[PDB]
Each structure stands twice: as structure tokens, then as C-alpha cells.
Symmetry: C2
Subunit: 469 residues, 2 copies
Amino acid sequence: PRLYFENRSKFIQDQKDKGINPYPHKFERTISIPEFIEKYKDLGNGEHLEDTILNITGRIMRVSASGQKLRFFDLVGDGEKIQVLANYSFHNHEKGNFAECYDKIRRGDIVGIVGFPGKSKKGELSIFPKETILLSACLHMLPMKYGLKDTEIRYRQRYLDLLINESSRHTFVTRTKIINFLRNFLNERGFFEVETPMMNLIPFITHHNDLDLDLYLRIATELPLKMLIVGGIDKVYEIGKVFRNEGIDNTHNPEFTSCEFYWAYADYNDLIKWSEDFFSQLVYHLFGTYKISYNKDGPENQPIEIDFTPPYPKVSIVEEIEKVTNTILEQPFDSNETIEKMINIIKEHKIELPNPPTAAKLLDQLASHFIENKYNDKPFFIVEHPQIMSPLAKYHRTKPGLTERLEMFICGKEVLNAYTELNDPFFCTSLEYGLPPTGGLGLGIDRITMFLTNKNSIKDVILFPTMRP
Amino acid sequence: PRLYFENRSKFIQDQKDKGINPYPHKFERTISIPEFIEKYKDLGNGEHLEDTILNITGRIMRVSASGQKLRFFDLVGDGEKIQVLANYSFHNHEKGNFAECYDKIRRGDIVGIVGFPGKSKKGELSIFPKETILLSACLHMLPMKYGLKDTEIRYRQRYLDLLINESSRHTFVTRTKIINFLRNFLNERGFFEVETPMMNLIPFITHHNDLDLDLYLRIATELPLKMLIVGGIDKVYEIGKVFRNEGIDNTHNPEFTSCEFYWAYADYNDLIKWSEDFFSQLVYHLFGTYKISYNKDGPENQPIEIDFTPPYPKVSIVEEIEKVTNTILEQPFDSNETIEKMINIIKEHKIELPNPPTAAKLLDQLASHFIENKYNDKPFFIVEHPQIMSPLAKYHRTKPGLTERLEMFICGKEVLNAYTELNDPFKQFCTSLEYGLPPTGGLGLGIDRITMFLTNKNSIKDVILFPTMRP
């Protein structure tokens, strides 16, 4: 184990002395494995193309022998596999001894191979080397599936994870496939991508040494973005990192990825139509249907189905709480007496942490309880939140005490938040130069990716999650 | 001035009790100003489309009057401009006084307009309102050109800049066009974009409360990118923010934007052609040729012509020094007396800051004097660097002391920097290398610096929407 190492190290020195470079400078490929597969998969069993000479590379993942006239390797690259069939009859002996060269090879080794394509007798697609040259050696024991999963080194050595586990590589592709989708989605709808400062002055604190000033890592991207709208970029967005300095767990990472866009002269039906479009067209683009399975209770429980077929419910938060709790407060002052009702509900009905007793805090727990877990079979919108809960959203045309806010929910997890902005000052300076009627919108990216890759931890959607040593 | 503001506020509280909402809820536009021009730009001077009723919104950038049946305005939207022509004849009197309405309107006001297309007699493209509403008001005196440039309020208030200076918004669109093009270029070549931490443990420091632990802000993306290569993602990049906790000025911001990719089984030739394909194609994508104008010494001075037509010159650094300084140094132990030979040059030749006189430091200096400013009529590659300056590149095949690094220069500024990685754990994360890192080529970019050359700027603050500015 540590012995495996020193022996490989010793081995590497001995090939340097024997006059070999175990880390040569360049081996020139002809083909990647995925290209080799598409071309020769449709070959026939036993078939050889002896007139085809190919230079290929990859990592050795299995090795096995069969008489020292015969040698077998699994070779991987780009998350696709083929077989190395080393036959003594084809081995160019002018370069070296058949068995002396092939007993050198170990699981993990990156090799260059020069040979021809073919299937074996059983129908297993293969490269037949005339020559095999080490490109880079694996000095450690490469572990096995079971070895990891479930282990913490999936995260501390994600490279091992990407090699051994076929499914984690697929997860990370999907996340990129999702982001590209999003970006192109906006771009088609005339939006405009921009970067704004990570660092500010409004909670992660860092010190700019020169300026002797404390700097502030962004929690959001709203403000610079709203200000660009004043600047007269009517459609603008940022896909980027934000930060929370809190606890670290399986739902909690120091840097999340957010997207936020602003949309001048865009109202409520507009934002909804967008959110409904985005998700129906994302999910379809990934899976070919609007229907997917998600393990809400983990892998040790069942999957449930989620129908991203539009349109989706819209649930007014106060209407649906009056309805169910069967008291009334539409009373668009939600304080004093109306605090008592809500407080009385919290204890009367089952329970829940009061928290510091703010009506907006009360309100949240009551939608958390009675609404957020309404629909699991589909994504839906909680809607027309009170002003008290939402200090930045323009007033509801008709309904007093109320906004035109929209949140999107999937399995009781928030995913999309949006509203038409409160443009009447009566950054706070920018607002005085005129901000037109505007719709803003923030997506949770990692969470969305958790759904579409069917993960229950965020570490499983972020390549290098932050980990206590 | 702060009274204008007092009057506008006053005006605003006055519309409310007059029974208006001067920040209404929804106006519903039929058309955008770019759409309006595109559509009606091929009209005939004088031609009116009175039947055709459009809605539209826009900021007011200008106001005149003409005897009070007439009122004129400039409206701007999405970096485009049109003329407002408010004629009493067409005014719809049900809604309010023609006079009373168009007198509230100030410069910097966002308005809904209902009206029809038509060119004037002069053939100036116009919107002719029958009704005009206030959406949101400029409560402040909106400055003009002259007003800003050359001011810090181009930065500390980037909206004003975006509105008034059409040549600034031109510029930040071009930033975006470039990064889109880069993104598209890697993608079309089978590269895979990814995201790595901005915070780590290895110079901006920030405490993490609940771990009672100091985190650090990333300076490059190279390390976790290489790891991804060992994980068998073979073509990989990130486009994103790196940081320096160093001094701020017109070359320096705490937040830069870099793109870095690794590419497996890629050599020097591969890296070179990459770079010459990219620059040549980027420039042709933006401008229509390979020839662009840059103002190296500023707008106050003359411009130069830079030709991005490939191929470009490859200048082997040590070689060119030996050829210019007419001394001979390599002697692939670049230390002791080799240092001296360089120091004497540094002394004998003009001079130059030694710095703490390190060999690699001495070598960097030499290159800035004798090479880096050789070409200004085209981009060229400084090439085959010492291992001593480049501790992370593979050795040259045949030339001792050297590497197969390439580093690109436009007008003596560093723009691109690539090299095949040193994969042998015994000539040097240091873990992962021991799992086998295939032969590989890495490459980094200065997005900002590149946007500068292509947006003809000399200041980084003219290419980053919100430069970090003394508070």
C-alpha cells in the first residue's frame, strides 16, 4: 500500500536508468476512444482491420492475462471504454519483449498504443497493439467502486471520483448542460450578460491592504444590476458566484451559483410565462420528456415523479392560509391584533418555532407549514406575498398590503424568486434618476441541478465543495 | 441644484394629491426603439402613418418648444435615439391639458408614449404622441457630455456613463461579444466549462466563522483544473474572476477576469495554432478585417495599426538576447557566473532595476528591455523560456534549461501564456500528480487586457463596469 508506492517509485527510477522515459514528451493520437467506438462498434465479431493503423491513448482500468501470448486490458478515456487485446503474434519484438513490456503495466497507467481495430470472438470491441508505451504512471493503488461511495474522498479527491464512478462524471456534465442551456435561453430572448463586483461594502469580510478598507463578498447581484437598467440596458443578467458565511452541511456551501436578470417593462404574467417556459424547456431538453424521478427521501427510499408540464399552479399565500386555517386576516395591516391571530395559529395548530415574533417571520412559518409542501407531484408558485415579507417589490395593483411577488417551488424547496421592482424612491441615488417598471428574477442553480441529477446533497453537484479537514 | 431636486420631489408629491401615479404600475409597449427605427427608417420625409397607433417607452434626453402648439423631445432606448414631436393638433384633450402635460416633462424622465410613426418634413424619424405619461422621473439634473469625461463619476456612477456616452455602452457590449466568442470557440472545439472554488486554503484573507478558519481568495484556476484532467475530463476551461490584494490604479483592479484551459496530449504547435486561430478569428469576428487601430500612448497622441493576420513571429528569448546584447548565455546552469553575465549587461547596458537580484528576476527584466517591445505592428510570441522562470512547465525536448512555453504580446503587454505541464512527480495537488497526469498543455488569458486592445482603451476602468474606487 505505502509499499506499492515506493515500489512504483523505484520502478520509475529504474526505467530512467534502463534508458526509458516513463513520462515522454508527446505521443501523437489519431483518435479518441469515443471516436474509435462510434466507428468500429458496428464492426462484426472476430473482424479485424489489419490495414488500419491507429494511435490511441487512455487509462488502464483492468488488467488480466491469458498465457503470455495473450494479455487483456480495459482502456478508458472521456468516460468511454474499449478493450486492449495484446497478442504475442502482433507484438513488434524489435522494440522489446512481449511479456517484459506488458507485466510492467498497472491499473491506472496512462498508455499510448499503436495498433489496429477489431472485435474479438465474443463481440467485444478492441484495439490490437503492435506497441504500447507508458505515457504517465499511476504511483498509487487506484481503489474500486465500493472503495469509495460512500466515502469522504469523493469530495477531497474528485479526480478519483471522476475516473472510477461513471455516474458522477455524468452528473457534472448535466450541470454544465444546464447552465449552457440557461445562458442561451436568455441570449435568445435578447438578454445581456454582465459581470459585477464579487467584492463590496455592505457576510464575508476581507481587507484590502493598500486602501486599509474592509471589503464585502457579495450575497447577491441585484443592486449593480438594477443600476445597469437605469443605465438603460433593458434586459441584463449575471450567472456567477455568491457567498454565505454560515454552517457547512449537505445543503450548505460557502459559495453558491446564482443567476439574476432584470427585465424593463416586464410585469407578472411575463415572469411566470418565463419561469414556465424555462423549466418545461430545460427538462425536456435534458430528458426528452417533462417527467422525472427524484429521490425526495434519499436513495434508501423510493423515487417520486415530478411533472414539469406547463402551466403550473399559482397559490396566493394569504388567500390559501385564510382558507385552510379558517380564520381571517386580510386586514392589510399585519401587526398587533393580526400578530395575535397568527401567533394563536402557531400553537393552536400543531406547532412550530415562533422565532423572534415578527409578522413577516410568522407569515413565513405559516406558508412553510401549510403551503410549501402542498405539491410534490409538480412544481408550483406561491404568489402575491404581503409587502411586509417583501420590502423591495412594487405594490399590488388591486390588493392592499400585498405585492405581485412569485416564488417557484419543487419538493418544498425554493427554486425561483421574482417580482416587479418598487421604483418610487418615496444605489438609492440611482433610483432617483429614474428606474422604469421592471421585473427581477433569481434562480437557485445548484438546487435545480440537484433535482435534475437526482441528488440530495449539494456536495454531489459542486466539484470541489468546501470541506473541514 | 439641490433645489431642482427639492422641486421635483415637490412636483412628485403634488401629482399624487392631484390624483396621478407618477410611478404607475404597468405601461404596455407595442415596440422597442431599436425596432421602431429598423421598421420606419425607410420612410419618406414628411410621411405620416396616422392610422398606426403604437405604444412606446424611453428616456427623455432633450427638450425644446416651438410656440406651444409644438414641443420636441429626444427619446433614447437600448442605446438608440428617436425624435418626439408633440403637436397640439394630435393631442387627445380628454386626458389633460396639452400645455400642462408637456411642461412637467424634464430631461432624464422615463415616459410612456402613445402615438404614431412618421418622419418630419426634414425626414427626421419621429414618434407623434396623442398621449404621453410619466413612468419614472429624473429627480436630479442630468449632466451632458462635457459633464463627464474626464470624471470619476464615469465609474462611481456607471449609469450616467451608459446613458450619455454611447461609445461606452458600445464598449461593454463588445466585452460581452468577446467572452461569448471565446466561450463559443472552446465549445466548438470540444472543451468542457466548469466551476472551481474562489475560496480555498493556501492574497485576500477572509475568516470563516463557523469553522473558525481563515479562507483565501483564489489567484488562478490552474490547480483544480489540472486535477480535473487526472479525473479524465480531457479538455477543460473556466471563465471567471481572480483576485490580487495589491494596489489599485488604471492598470489594476482587485478583481480580474481570466479564462484558463487545459488540453490533454496537446503540444506547443497545438497551443500556437490555437492562439493564432483564436486572435485572428476573434478580430475578424468583431471588425471585418485583421487590422485594427490602437491608441498606445493615449487619445492625446497618435494611434497605431496592429495586424492580427497569422501567422505571427516566434522569438526565442535567450537566443534574441544573445543576438542583441551580443553576449552568450545559457550554459544550462542559469546560476552564479551566468547571473553575473546578465547583471553586467544590466549595468553596462542602459540600466534597469535589478530588484532583489534573482536569476529569474534578472531574466524577466532583460526580456522587458530587449524583447517585449520589439513588435507593436502585430502580436508576437516570446518563446522557449528558462525552466527557472517557469517552474511548472515541462522541459524542452532538446534545449537544456529551456521549456516549450509560449507567451503572447500585443504592444508590449502580456496577453496569452501557455505551456505543456510538467507531469513527472519527481521533477517537481502534488498528490494527484502521482495518480498520473497525462501530457498536457495549459493556457491562460487576460480578458480585460484583451478587451482594452479591442475597445481601444488604455485604462482597465474603461473596460470593467464597476471599477473598485476609493469610497
